[PDB]
């Protein structure tokens, strides 16, 4: 029912560098997650151009940001193309192995963590703020799966029995106890307006 | 043998704005083309992760920049995933219609042409420098096609009889007579080092 996998070695080293490096501008995680949502949305929209039944599983293309101060989670929901099980296992549909190689080389020579997105591995910046990240996802061609990792070199995959999502991806960020400012309306808005002003999809910040 | 198509109205307006707006920093076209090559390369690499026969049509993933001062062309070749005929007709595998809408809205309120890539329509910046652009392309699932446009509201598509490319895309830029500085070794290198320093594929500048 639950499958446990080892991260590839270079992805574990990336996750460790992100968890351990002293670096204060942690707010960039949101930009990287939202830009991934936008790319997934760009994809389903492209497919729908020539096949509108691709949107049978939901016509609206949007991003939702949902803070929950009780659970201490920040959730980013998009109704993009989503991921098959095979995508999730392969580093969440990314060429992460070679993206890590380039990113760690760039660091050694000048670069800082904020440039992570340029190497195609922005997702792992969630670990600047989250002790555990849970990706729920549903692709037209597959069933609904949950991926999960508290880092430490392994991640799990299970078919998800939670709330059906139609199509898309939900990234649930279980936040480190000192990172709860990202659950504050004030701070989220500041970040989105600063870093995501030219995303082509409505972004709705849920209030509690 | 030759099919002629009308640009969608908003793509023609984008092309016209790019051709007519007074704007001096035209050098950005190269960054936008090379970043498209990188994305096509990211794609074939991803597919190959789980199916290595995807690289039967060529194992090397690279970008070539080829100036020809005689023909007055600058060519950008990549061995990325390439495009099917259907992709080429649909605005070269992009959601160009809605990307134009966002880009022209951003312009009206602050933005400048250099941000074109953020709206997913970087390709059309080739018209800052080229009087005519010819895209040759080959995708594993289709035959080799050539797309062509001197703007003016129409583009053509034909199956290509030129030199077989295996897999990838060649963008041939027939340069405006006052834009020949982009055929100079000096200037190309300046531009690549400035704007494309973190592309994850070798870029080889051909000498004449
Ligand atoms: O080209 S993509 O595979 N687009 C894509 C497709 C489906 C998806 O569910 C996502 C996606 C999201 O929509 C949301 C979060 C993601 C986190 C890691 C990887 C992909 C995420 C992204 C991509 C992956 C990583 C950055 S862009
Ligand atoms: O997601 S993509 O469809 N990637 C992709 C796939 C195959 C390709 O041949 C290209 C591509 C190139 O490799 C080179 C030039 C292009 C110009 C316009 C559109 C796509 C170009 C780009 C994309 C299209 C436009 C910007 S990124």
From Swiss-Prot, chains A, B:
GO BP: any one term: positive regulation of protein catabolic process
UniProt-annotated binding residues for ATP: 36, 78, 97, 123
Subcellular location: Nucleus; Cytoplasm; Melanosome; Cell membrane
Region listing for Interaction with NR3C1, in residue ranges: 1-208
Keywords recorded for this protein, A-Z: Acetylation, ATP-binding, Cell membrane, Chaperone, Cytoplasm, Host-virus interaction, Hydrolase, Membrane, Mitochondrion, Nucleotide-binding, Nucleus, Phosphoprotein, S-nitrosylation, Stress response, Ubl conjugation
Post-translational modification: ISGylated.
GO cellular component assignments: apical plasma membrane; axonal growth cone; basolateral plasma membrane; brush border membrane; cell surface; cytoplasm; cytosol; dendritic growth cone
Consequence of substituting residue 78 to A: Impaired ATP-binding. Strong interaction with HIF1A, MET, KEAP1 and RHOBTB2. Loss of interaction with HSF1 and ERBB2. Los of interaction with TSC1
Sites of N6-acetyllysine modification: 43, 69
GO molecular function: ATP binding; ATP hydrolysis activity; ATP-dependent protein folding chaperone; CTP binding; dATP binding; disordered domain specific binding; DNA polymerase binding; enzyme-substrate adaptor activity
Tree of life domain: Eukaryota
Subunit composition and interactions: Homodimer. Identified in NR3C1/GCR steroid receptor-chaperone complexes formed at least by NR3C1, HSP90AA1 and a variety of proteins containing TPR repeats such as FKBP4, FKBP5, PPID, PPP5C or STIP1. Forms a complex containing HSP90AA1, TSC1 and TSC2; TSC1 is required to recruit TCS2 to the complex. The closed form interacts (via the middle domain and TPR repeat-binding motif) with co-chaperone TSC1 (via C-terminus). Interacts with TOM34. Interacts with TERT; the interaction, together with PTGES3, is required for correct assembly and stabilization of the TERT holoenzyme complex. (Microbial infection) Interacts with herpes simplex virus 1 protein US11; this interaction inhibits TBK1-induced interferon production.
Protein family according to the UniProt entry: Belongs to the heat shock protein 90 family.
Domain comment quoted from the record: The TPR repeat-binding motif mediates interaction with TPR repeat-containing proteins like the co-chaperone STUB1.
Purpose of the protein: Molecular chaperone that promotes the maturation, structural maintenance and proper regulation of specific target proteins involved for instance in cell cycle control and signal transduction. Undergoes a functional cycle that is linked to its ATPase activity which is essential for its chaperone activity. This cycle probably induces conformational changes in the client proteins, thereby causing their activation. Interacts dynamically with various co-chaperones that modulate its substrate recognition, ATPase cycle and chaperone function.
Protein name (Swiss-Prot/TrEMBL): Heat shock protein HSP 90-alpha
Biological source species: Homo sapiens
């Amino acid at each position: 029912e639950v499958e446990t996998f080892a991260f590839q070695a270079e992805i574990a080293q990336l996750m460790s560098l992100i968890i351990n490096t002293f670096y204060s501008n942690k707010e960039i995680f949101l930009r990287e997650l939202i830009s991934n949502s936008s790319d997934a949305l760009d994809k389903i929209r492209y497919e729908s151009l020539t096949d509108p039944s691709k949107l049978d599983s939901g016509k609206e293309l949007h991003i939702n940001l949902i803070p929950n101060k009780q659970d201490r989670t920040l959730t980013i929901v998009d109704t993009g193309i989503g991921m098959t099980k095979a995508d999730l296992i392969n580093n969440l549909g990314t060429i992460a192995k070679s993206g890590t190689k380039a990113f760690m080389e760039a660091l050694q020579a000048g670069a800082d963590i904020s440039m992570i997105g340029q190497f195609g591995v922005g997702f792992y910046s969630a670990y600047l703020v989250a002790e555990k990240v849970t990706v729920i996802t549903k692709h037209n061609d597959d069933e609904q799966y949950a991926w999960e990792s508290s880092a430490g070199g392994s991640f799990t995959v299970r078919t998800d029995t939670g709330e059906p999502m139609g199509r898309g991806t939900k990234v649930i960020l279980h936040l480190k106890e000192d990172q709860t400012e990202y659950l504050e309306e004030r701070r989220i808005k500041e970040i989105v307006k600063k870093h995501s002003q030219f995303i082509g999809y409505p972004i709705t910040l849920f209030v509690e």
